């Protein structure tokens, strides 16, 4: 668990520990503690139906860029766990969800 402390009204660019071993396709998940988990970003730029324009990702053009999650203006209700389901091309099937990253909002 890697806690990231960001106060209210400030942006947060949360990455994950697994680096890009080639062409990647990450799936960001928001897991509220006890409630149902939800999807944030699939295919690194596509937003599903139910996510507004606050959670944005980075495209995979010109490989060498990192896989992160940009939250512009995080509200008070975004106190949950964030997962980086990294699917690269050279490491095969990734059954594990990775490190459970707990975002801590200050204030």
């Amino acid at each position: 668990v890697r806690p990231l402390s960001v106060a209210l009204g400030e942006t947060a660019r949360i990455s994950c520990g697994r680096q890009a071993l080639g062409s990647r396709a990450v799936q960001w998940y928001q897991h509220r503690p006890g409630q149902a988990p939800i999807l944030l970003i699939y295919n690194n730029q596509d937003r599903p139906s139910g996510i507004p324009e606050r959670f944005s990702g980075t495209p995979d053009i010109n490989f060498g860029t990192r896989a992160t999650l940009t939250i512009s203006g995080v509200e008070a209700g975004d106190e949950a766990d964030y997962y980086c389901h990294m699917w690269d091309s050279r490491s095969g099937f990734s059954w594990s969800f990775g490190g459970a990253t707990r975002l801590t909002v200050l204030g």
Partner: nanobody, 132 residues
Framework: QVQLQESGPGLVKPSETLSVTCSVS????????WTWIRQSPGKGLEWIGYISDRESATYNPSLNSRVVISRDTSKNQLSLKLNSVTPADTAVYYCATARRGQRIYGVVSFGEFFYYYSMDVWGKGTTVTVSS
């Protein structure tokens, strides 16, 4: 839109069968993948296994195929049984649906593509435990 509802026994003993049913309504199982995700209290999320329309009985490495996920298209549910459970397997179990989208980086004729899975619609989950 699909609606996922789950229900289980809630309390198990060691060396038993933890069979939890996850029923769906609204849409059928024609083009909808099915999977189960577990998470122990104090631990992170853990994909234990998935099933497809071709009866893909593939499961997580930690699980080591000790669990079976069954997909019965007659009575429209998704069952997940856990034979020979351990007392250190207390977790809250979520069932979700997946999408087999392929990420193509090279050509498709050589096999330069991989399948990534997006668990879009989830369930609220049941909290099972191992007690005395």
């Amino acid at each position: 839109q699909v609606q996922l509802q789950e229900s289980g026994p809630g309390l198990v003993k060691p060396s038993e069968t933890l069979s939890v049913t996850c029923s769906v309504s609204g849409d059928s199982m024609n083009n909808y993948y099915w999977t189960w995700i577990r998470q122990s209290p104090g631990k992170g999320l853990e994909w234990i296994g998935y099933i497809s329309d071709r009866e893909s009985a593939t499961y997580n490495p930690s699980l080591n195929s000790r669990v079976v996920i069954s997909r019965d298209t007659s009575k429209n549910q998704l069952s997940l049984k856990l034979n020979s459970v351990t007392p250190a397997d207390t977790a809250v179990y979520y069932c979700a649906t997946a999408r087999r989208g392929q990420r193509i980086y090279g050509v498709v004729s050589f096999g330069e593509f991989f399948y990534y899975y997006s668990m879009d619609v989830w369930g609220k989950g049941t909290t099972v435990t191992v007690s005395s």
